[PDB]
Amino acid sequence: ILQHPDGTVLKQLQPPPRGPRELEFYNMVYAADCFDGVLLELRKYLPKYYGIWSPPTAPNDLYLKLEDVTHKFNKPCIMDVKIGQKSYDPFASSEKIQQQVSKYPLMEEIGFLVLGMRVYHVHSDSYETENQHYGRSLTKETIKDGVSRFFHNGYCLRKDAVAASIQKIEKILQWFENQKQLNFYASSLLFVYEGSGGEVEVRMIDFAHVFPSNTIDEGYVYGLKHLISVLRSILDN
Ligand SMILES: FC(F)(F)c1ccc(-c2onc3ccc(-c4nnn[nH]4)cc23)cc1
């Protein structure tokens, strides 16, 4: 992800088939002639899409130009959470399924995985960051405290941002409870709150494994529900 001062990010297409799949997802949802009620509502929860972009002198080099969801913040606190019980898709080989489950074997049980976070600490005017090994090290016993960390600014727990996050997720959940045409594997929620403010973003990202479906995305729903439950518990801290 390249942050551009114009308030967008450039995301390089991942190798095939993942990159091409994510391109077609954005093209389907943001089709200018789309009047599918499900897809028009879905746009509310995604980064705005500005189309495919490539460097003037390098048409081979494909990017997605997306809204930078962090742009309007002064000191954005950012957390990426992968949602679902399965981070492998319906076309995964036994090898790939094993590869994916082993990356985080607790995915089925918890329904979400923290990919990383960047948290502003007020007292030091500095950031603390966690990488993929943080979330992959969390268990049922430690997930509540693991998520809580995102919302602690060194001084206090930001229950305002926690409650706001629940309210934003509930709208995404409602979208999922009212559609049976897409299932999302290995996709994420991007959480942003103001570290230096009640303003909160929660947006769906990373669509390299979104597939047409005839059923509720039950894995995604389980994950959202569990994540909401954890956030709800944190409000009692
Ligand atoms: F923490 C960082 F590194 F500073 C960071 C991470 C993600 C973003 C970010 O802001 N808007 C996005 C929109 C989409 C994505 C994205 N899509 N797929 N993978 N990441 C990422 C986005 C911005 C900053």
UniProtKB/Swiss-Prot annotation:
Cystine pairs: none
Keyword Nucleotide-binding attached: yes
Pathway stated in the Swiss-Prot or TrEMBL entry = Phospholipid metabolism; phosphatidylinositol metabolism
What Enzyme Commission number(s) does the record list for this chain? Answer: 2.7.1.140, 2.7.1.151, 2.7.1.153
Q: How is its activity regulated?
A: Inhibited by flavonoids that occupy the ATP-binding pocket. Inhibited by myricetin, quercetin, luteolin, kaempferol, isorhamnetin and diosmetin, and to a lesser degree by rhamnetin and apigenin.
The biological processes this protein is annotated with in GO are: inositol phosphate biosynthetic process; inositol phosphate metabolic process; inositol trisphosphate metabolic process; necroptotic process; phosphatidylinositol metabolic process
What domain of life does the UniProt record list for this protein's source?
Eukaryota
Q: Reply yes or no: does the keyword Phosphoprotein apply.
A: yes
Q: Which GO terms describe its molecular function?
A: 1-phosphatidylinositol-4,5-bisphosphate 3-kinase activity; ATP binding; flavonoid binding; inositol tetrakisphosphate kinase activity; inositol-1,3,4,5-tetrakisphosphate 6-kinase activity; inositol-1,3,4,6-tetrakisphosphate 5-kinase activity; inositol-1,4,5,6-tetrakisphosphate 3-kinase activity; inositol-1,4,5-trisphosphate 3-kinase activity
Query: What reaction does this enzyme carry out catalytically?
Result: 1D-myo-inositol 1,4,5-trisphosphate + 2 ATP = 1D-myo-inositol 1,3,4,5,6-pentakisphosphate + 2 ADP + 2 H(+); 1D-myo-inositol 1,3,4,6-tetrakisphosphate + ATP = 1D-myo-inositol 1,3,4,5,6-pentakisphosphate + ADP + H(+); 1-octadecanoyl-2-(5Z,8Z,11Z,14Z)-eicosatetraenoyl-sn-glycero-3-phospho-1D-myo-inositol 4,5-bisphosphate + ATP = 1-octadecanoyl-2-(5Z,8Z,11Z,14Z-eicosatetraenoyl)-sn-glycero-3-phospho-(1D-myo-inositol 3,4,5-triphosphate) + ADP + H(+); a 1,2-diacyl-sn-glycero-3-phospho-(1D-myo-inositol-4,5-bisphosphate) + ATP = a 1,2-diacyl-sn-glycero-3-phospho-(1D-myo-inositol-3,4,5-trisphosphate) + ADP + H(+)
Substituting residue 103 to A results in: Decreased enzyme activity
Cellular localization per UniProt: Nucleus
State how changing residue 209 to A affects the protein, per the record.
Loss of enzyme activity
Expression (tissue specificity): Ubiquitous, with the highest expression in skeletal muscle, liver, placenta, lung, peripheral blood leukocytes, kidney, spleen and colon.
Q: Name the enzyme's class.
A: transferase
Sites where the protein binds ATP: 11, 67-69, 80, 206
Co-factor requirement: Mg(2+)
Record key words, sorted: Acetylation, ATP-binding, Kinase, Lipid metabolism, Magnesium, Metal-binding, Nucleotide-binding, Nucleus, Phospholipid metabolism, Phosphoprotein, Transferase
Q: Where does substrate bind?
A: 18, 82, 96-103, 132, 209
One Gene Ontology cellular component annotation?
ciliary basal body
Sequence similarity? Belongs to the inositol phosphokinase (IPK) family.
**Known function:** Inositol phosphate kinase with a broad substrate specificity. Phosphorylates inositol 1,4,5-trisphosphate (Ins(1,4,5)P3) first to inositol 1,3,4,5-tetrakisphosphate and then to inositol 1,3,4,5,6-pentakisphosphate (Ins(1,3,4,5,6)P5). Phosphorylates inositol 1,3,4,6-tetrakisphosphate (Ins(1,3,4,6)P4). Phosphorylates inositol 1,4,5,6-tetrakisphosphate (Ins(1,4,5,6)P4). Phosphorylates glycero-3-phospho-1D-myo-inositol 4,5-bisphosphate to glycero-3-phospho-1D-myo-inositol 3,4,5-trisphosphate.
Name by which UniProt lists this protein:
Inositol polyphosphate multikinase
Q: Which organism is it from?
A: Homo sapiens
